[PDB]
């Protein structure tokens, strides 16, 4: 139901990412308005959102100007994602994936000290997987929850313990969640995290006062293998029918480079998610 | 000055740096605390991955800015 992408030289990290981005129609609409690398990207995503295509021209332009890699090594789809988003920037209007946080730092050791406020800007949320039921909702809750930070206190004139709290200040039309699947072992070595992290078709980002924003899952990039070698595939929604062009299909696809297959939702939800792409309802 | 790095588990560490510090110098300081070799570190600030050979000031990284650290999972 969609074109596959040929794997010329370990390019599944690109193919899988393009398959997922092409399932985000608000991102495609943003790109169309922005273009009214972007055009090279847009033309691929239009084709992939409705045969085998070749995405290598996008990699050629990226290698020329944005990312010094060779043409044939394995790479991280998440690193390519940030190369793409940061190439579009070169804040709100240039960041269709951008989440903003308002942060507050409160000194636990000096009740008189005034809190300081800060801002964080992110184009993906890189969640940590705790030690092993693992759920994306819990990882997200933990990411946004309060944390301890040590920093110099103007009032105490030494390092002191602070608590940082965060509130989401900007909601994007498109959302990329990155489940970190490389951790650092107790032996001082990298470790691939294979554990299933449960996720739903629907995701809610909380806001002040009980307000929140609902998002709907469009695609999942999955990494198979280890950090010495692996393979990326994508589960994505089919394009909508022409008679319901702004609807969201309930048909899912498994796409591994040049091969496209129908997949059940249950297969999608059972997969080992690495990047999850959502759009704001 | 101090900057903060959110590490692989979400714990946020604090580094002592200067605006003229190179990204390599910053990764070395992260290696001192976390044990992760610099060629395995991906550092992100405001969505942009930091490149070796540039300085914190090249990225407008100021006092008490926050970086995110992730590893590189290749396929």
Residue numbers in the entry:
A (entry chain A): 66 to 101, 116 to 129, 136 to 175, 218 to 259, 263 to 301, 318 to 361, 437 to 502
B (entry chain B): 1 to 75
Task: Provide passages from the article that reported this PDB entry.
The mitochondrial deubiquitinase ubiquitin-specific protease (USP) 30 negatively regulates PINK1–parkin-driven mitophagy. By grafting structural elements of well-crystallizable human USP family members onto the periphery of the human USP30 protein, we generated stabilized and crystallizable protein constructs that retain DUB activity and the propensity to compound inhibition. This process is illustrated with four diverse chimeras: chimera 1 (USP30ch1) features the fingers of USP7, chimera 2 (USP30ch2) features the fingers of USP14, chimera 3 (USP30ch3) features the fingers of USP14 and the box 4–5 insertion of USP35, and chimera 4 (USP30ch4) features the fingers of CYLD.
Upon surveying the collected data, we decided to focus on USP30ch3. This construct containing the USP14 fingers and the USP35 box 4–5 insertion features unaltered catalytic activity, displays an increased protein stability by approximately 4 °C and reacts readily with Ub-PA. To validate our design, we solved the crystal structure of the covalent USP30ch3~Ub-PA complex. Both a rather high rate of initial crystal hits in coarse-screening plates and the high resolution of 1.5 Å without crystallization fine screening supported the hypothesis of increased crystallizability of this chimeric protein. Chimeras 1–3 showed complete binding to the ubiquitin probe Ub-PA, which correlated with protein stabilization, whereas this was not the case for constructs with truncated fingers. The superposition also revealed large and surprising conformational changes of the switching loop that allow the N-tert-butyl-benzenesulfonamide group to bind deeply within the thumb subdomain. This cryptic pocket is not present in previously analyzed ubiquitin-bound states.
